[PDB]
Symmetry: D2
Subunit: 332 residues, 4 copies
């Protein structure tokens, strides 16, 4: 079927499945899984960091990432629309006892440093203790300006703040940048990697940072429930994906801007196109209707005034042609 709801719907490729069934495993609680360790070391090395850790979800990757950075009473400055603030049921505050300090991101997706500075609280018993600055490289598809990344890292060091990046779709950014992962990963103390979305993995996310940081991450992961056993089978896929599915992300990107043009031709009001994501202003009076129309044509989208269409390896251009045709028919 044609699914444009999220790149999270990506299913295992033939090659990936065999890599998995082939991978050697062990008990990762003891650290005896060759594959988990191999994936963790690859990411670490690939990003220029000391150590990495495998978690069940990107949600748990960020929760653990936040608990690891901030103690009870500390606070993190994040985007009002960032994932580890808005889309993680408020875990950091509810579970971690961390005060969140959200601020609106700028149009390009960055967090205005002048605003971040204004939110750093003085060492007064009145306020929470600002500790972390969280970013999200690839925010609703937008790739942060490389210069800004350098600026934030520099900014944080000057203010003694830790810097963490939600790299759910960090490889989309990499491919869009045209550089290596380590070249953007140098500007953050820690960052996450989701294997389950664009890279085509069934389950999996990674938190990468220095040795000590990750050791604290290990205690938190166990507590939050991520301490799995024979994760080797899952990690195997993650290794295969990092060595065979990063480059093709460019194919998704061209499909996004290709589709963006088709919908423009058809008459749909396209709001913007960034990486594997495009947004259309469908409208309130056409939301649910378009949903059904499509859903009928075996096309799955998230019905809404502003529909977010996401691309991935399980959607071809030909299939996009179909949806662009079905859409054109909708509007006229």
């Amino acid at each position: 079927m044609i699914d444009l709801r999220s790149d999270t719907v990506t299913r295992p490729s033939r090659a990936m499945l065999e890599a998995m069934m082939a991978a050697p495993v062990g008990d990762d609680v003891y650290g005896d899984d060759p594959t988990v360790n191999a994936l963790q070391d690859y990411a670490a090395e690939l990003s220029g960091k000391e150590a990495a850790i495998f978690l069940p979800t990107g949600t748990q990757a960020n929760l653990v990432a936040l608990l690891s950075h901030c103690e009870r009473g500390e606070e993190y400055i994040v985007g009002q629309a960032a994932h580890n603030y808005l889309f993680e049921a408020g875990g950091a505050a509810v579970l971690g006892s961390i005060q969140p300090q959200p601020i609106d991101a700028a149009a390009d997706g960055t967090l205005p440093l002048d605003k971040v500075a204004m939110k750093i609280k003085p060492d007064d018993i009145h306020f929470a203790r600002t500790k972390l600055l969280s970013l999200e490289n690839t925010h609703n598809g937008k790739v942060l300006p490389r210069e800004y990344l350098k600026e934030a890292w520099e900014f944080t060091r000057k203010r003694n703040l830790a810097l963490h990046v939600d790299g759910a779709r960090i490889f989309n950014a990499v491919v869009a940048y045209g550089c290596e992962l380590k070249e953007i990963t140098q500007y953050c103390d820690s960052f996450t990697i989701c294997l389950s979305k664009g890279l085509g993995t069934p389950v999996g996310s990674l938190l990468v940072g220095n040795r000590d940081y990750i050791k604290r991450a290990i205690r938190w992961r166990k507590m939050t429930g991520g301490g799995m056993r024979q994760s080797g089978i899952l990690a195997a896929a993650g290794m295969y994906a990092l060595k065979n599915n990063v480059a093709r992300l460019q194919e998704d990107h061209d499909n996004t801007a290709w589709m963006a043009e088709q919908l423009r031709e058809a008459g749909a009001d396209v709001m913007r196109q960034d990486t594997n994501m495009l947004f259309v202003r469908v409208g309130e009076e056409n939301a649910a209707a378009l949903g059904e129309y499509m859903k009928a044509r075996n096309v799955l989208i998230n019905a809404s005034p502003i529909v977010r269409l996401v691309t991935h390896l399980d959607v071809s251009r030909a299939q996009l042609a179909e949806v662009a045709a079905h859409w054109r028919a909708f509007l006229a």
Copy 2:
């Protein structure tokens, strides 16, 4: 000694102390303290609410209120500069496992209902569960419009959201409206009352609401550590304060409005003036230099590029006239 730093410096008048030293007391934990109970029933009756609870501080009155309103994982929309979000060291999140959703307040001190609406979370496992809208009347002196208070009240009912008002200086707004307290508390499910501010009490606050709500608040006040014993001694100052110090707040207002013209007609840059508060932009170069010049003449003002002068019952106009002069002498 001339303290324009805050209205929190007000000291007990001899009549207040006597009222305290001659009050009958009992074990409040056992609910055997006459004066405490008397103070509560009086606040409840005067505001149209069923019950009331006395607490050590407003900070605790709000932490308790927030805990009594939101279960673990629940959320409260508030102002980025509001007290129960910014000035209570993130208590609601750190201790109460409550997710805070702060937004910028409009110029007049209100939380734009349109902005508030966009922040109400869809009922999806993705988000925290929006449950409370917490206001602040008298917000840095600013008196919230009355039509907004009625509109927020209606908005929250149609959204099934509770409405709480941090009334640390509610009586200041009350005198400014020229109405009864009941006429504004009718637009909220719960509100607080600090007696230790302009009303001149040594310490103590009140949280008022529905009988069942307050019953829960009693469990939280205990856990947080506010369940005192013979606190009727303190509650006594409260009654005395509520029966004699409400009307004279108009005197503080006139003085602030007075000082404003004097400082203005003296070379000072008066940004704005609301109730017992005045704001003068002094700037870097003269900030710290101003604090010292004053500190010497016994005039205490929180130095800063933008100084906040707070009038209260312990600062006379004559004394203000003096400071004024001392400020017109600062420029030369």
Copy 3:
């Protein structure tokens, strides 16, 4: 390789892997994964419960269960040596703001109802609010008496307390009782099921209960980070495991009971033997020395003055006979 450390080392059989590699999957967050849903409905139906939820680990199945049962400030009575109190880094309190009330378990593994009763808190603001009684069937191998399970069930209803059972090895007790799973799950409101232990799955657990309870558990599983995507691949091993690996647990039991006689009739001090678990008091002087002697011959046993040997599908009797010999050779 001979791992008697835990039954958590069980590795996937080729038939299990195939079942996993050929399973249809979908986005579980969207509830679109056939196998995951299939696995849940099967566990629910087989236990007499309305709903079921798949999780990354048992540790998370219990944290979620506890959170779904107790609101902030609520409490759960448990065993001092129980898993959701002792071996999950205090998660219920640290992350869930739940007060734990642990008590020593009787010799047979049960929590003495008389002791439990004394621990139920009076409804007074002095105490936490007792709400759950959490058991553990198979408790270090010990099979809880059936009359106690029925008695705890009745006790909790007459006290209006929920009853949860940590069933990490529930099927081990089940085979030992010689009854159906439904006949014991009928005595609890919720229970867990680990598939990654004796049942031989690579990872995964289940929490089962009433439809409304489980709906809440879904919100908590997300927040804690267990809301995976195409997890049907994992859920597949679970179904395969539940349809083929339950009965053969009797083989582990016989082997443990077998090894016990061998080690006993060899000079070893066998304290006790329950289901797939055996305990031998080795003592200080021979503890670490034993671990090394074994470690060399590839036999892995958690060294300690009191060694805990765990049998499972990946350790044959023939292999046990070998270890045995290697142990009778340790004394000389």
Copy 4:
């Protein structure tokens, strides 16, 4: 009236009241209260510690004491029947995110060190991180053996554990010991002092420890709501009590063992007598009945199978004679 429910019902003496109305005050949030500072320095000096802090309640003193000692995920070993575990609505876990590890106290009221050692968790991700050992000198009236205090302190230093003592009635212990406060205070890193119970204060408790510890206590107190303003009026009483009400505690003690004898003569089954507390095994079938009988004779006690009678300065021996007579009449 005659109140034997608790020494918390103690009311202000003429001398105390005048000391209060006389005391000079200020804003303690800024630290400008002469009296609060004077009380804090007196306690500190009197106990041989660096600094002290004034809180509204003993409950908040312990909560703050626990938050100050243990970070999120750390754990404290305390008595199953200790106040900061059982009688503080579980604040440490609910609010502080601290895992509690309670164990039964021995008959003399101490925590068997052999048990404490058994509960210290290894540095493994399975367990919470043992950090603090909490004691309660004067536990239900029992005075801990001095030798044991020395032992626990020594024990904790050897194990790198912090030691805290709930000194709600620490002065009862002092008077019973016959030594100075500093001689028992040397065996703890921190300890609390309740001014509101036996010492005859209306409100008030103190936490005493080293400079850094108390500084952390200050941030926590503010967050939990204890940061009061003109606390001078309350502190004044606390100073008067520490200089005029410690010695007479002996009068309460003799009244307790005097009354214990009278009740024995009358026929009541006295369980034990320690300091200002005695326990009678009234029985279930006579609980409520005795309550009314007494309550009628204007005598207030906590009705129960085992009645706890507490002495204090507001109950004279003559009044005890009355109650012992009313009791005798009850039984015969």
